[PDB]
Write an enzyme that holds these catalytic residues in place. Structure first.
Site, short mmCIF file in Angstrom:
data_model
loop_
_atom_site.label_atom_id
_atom_site.label_comp_id
_atom_site.label_asym_id
_atom_site.label_seq_id
_atom_site.Cartn_x
_atom_site.Cartn_y
_atom_site.Cartn_z
N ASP A 91 16.47 11.19 1.58
CA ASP A 91 15.69 9.98 1.49
C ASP A 91 14.83 9.79 2.74
O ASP A 91 15.32 9.32 3.75
CB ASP A 91 16.63 8.77 1.33
N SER A 138 -3.69 6.53 3.06
CA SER A 138 -4.48 7.31 2.12
C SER A 138 -5.93 6.84 2.14
O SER A 138 -6.20 5.67 2.39
CB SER A 138 -3.89 7.16 0.71
#
Length: 330
Positions: free
Chosen positions: A35, A199
């Site tokens: 994770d 992004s």
């Protein structure tokens, strides 16, 4: 040193991925959920409330000659999906794919919430976010990667998740045969303890690319892709019959649909998520309403590049002094 381990989806939807981990002496092999959005290595154990164990393999520290109670230490964690666990702590030898760390904090669960109990295939989690998020008190502990870092050939690990197929976690090296083209690296903020990056925009299907900064985290422990409501609305508007359902808890779409791809930007590069990756199947057994793999982050408080996005790429988690993230197509 290096390590290399295969990671395998737990079910036919890729709801999560498990990777075998050796703990203790002699080895006890548990299948853990790696994770990158948390920083605790915790396991089902001989200490876990018996009624909260249903099929998991447990770690039994009393059978390990290298296990030592970390006296006074406790831990307690709550995840974004509302699940939680807590317990005490041992140190022991932990190996992943041939890479060994001695003195690793292994957090032994005394209590786990229902979602963990109900998932018989996940024996615990291995956190790979920054150690500043680790929940051990009163002495915070380091992640497996943080402990391994100095011994690694290069201070990196990579995630190469499969779509309905096995993939690979590598530590200490970049497998240049595992991706196509070049890797594009992008800046990371560790301010929130995550692999947080920005992004450069998105496209829906064959549509034009929209240049827009989207801050989010690279999180192997989250199934889906969670993005701003504007972005998600633009995606689902291209699917006839798609709608956001309050009763179901997100966007649903007709199971008869052909889903468009979704592209996200990494600097000047582009990662394309095929439409099929966005199908999470019937909302309930036999339903003709299917659950979407792109969902709104509104009310999460953060955008999450979960498995839906990450499995479309070869992803480099660069833990050099100034961390960065790299993405390549594959």
């Amino acid at each position: 040193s290096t390590g290399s381990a295969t990671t395998t989806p737990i079910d036919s939807l890729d709801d999560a991925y498990i990777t075998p981990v050796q703990i203790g002496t002699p080895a006890q092999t548990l299948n853990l959920d790696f994770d990158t959005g948390s920083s605790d290595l915790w396991v089902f154990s001989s200490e876990t409330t018996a009624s909260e164990v249903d099929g998991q393999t447990i770690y039994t520290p009393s059978k390990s000659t290298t296990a030592k109670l970390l006296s006074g230490a406790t831990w307690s964690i709550s995840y974004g999906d509302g699940s939680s666990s807590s317990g005490d702590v041992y140190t022991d030898t932990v190996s992943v794919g041939g890479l060994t760390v001695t003195g690793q904090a292994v957090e032994s669960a005394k209590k786990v919430s229902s979602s963990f109990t109900e998932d018989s295939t996940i024996d615990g989690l291995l956190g790979l976010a920054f150690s500043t998020l680790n929940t051990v008190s009163p002495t915070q502990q380091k992640t497996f990667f943080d402990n391994a870092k100095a011994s690694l050939d290069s201070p990196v690990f990579t995630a190469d998740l499969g779509y309905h197929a096995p993939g690979t976690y590598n530590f200490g090296f970049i497998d240049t045969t595992a991706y196509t083209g070049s890797i594009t690296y992008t800046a990371v903020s560790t301010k929130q303890g995550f692999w947080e990056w920005t992004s450069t925009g998105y496209a829906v299907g064959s549509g034009t690319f929209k240049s827009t900064s989207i801050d989010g985290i690279a999180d192997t422990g989250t199934t889906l892709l969670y993005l701003p409501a504007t972005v998600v609305s633009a995606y689902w508007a291209q699917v006839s019959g798609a709608k956001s359902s309050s009763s179901v808890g997100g966007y649903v779409f007709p199971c008869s649909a052909t889903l468009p791809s979704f592209t996200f930007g990494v600097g000047s590069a582009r990662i394309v998520i095929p439409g099929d990756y966005i199908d999470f199947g019937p909302i309930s057994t036999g339903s003709s309403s299917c659950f979407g793999g792109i969902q709104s982050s509104a009310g999460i408080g953060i955008n999450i590049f979960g498995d839906v996005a990450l499995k479309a790429a070869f992803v480099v988690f660069n833990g050099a002094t100034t961390p960065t993230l790299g993405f390549a197509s594959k």
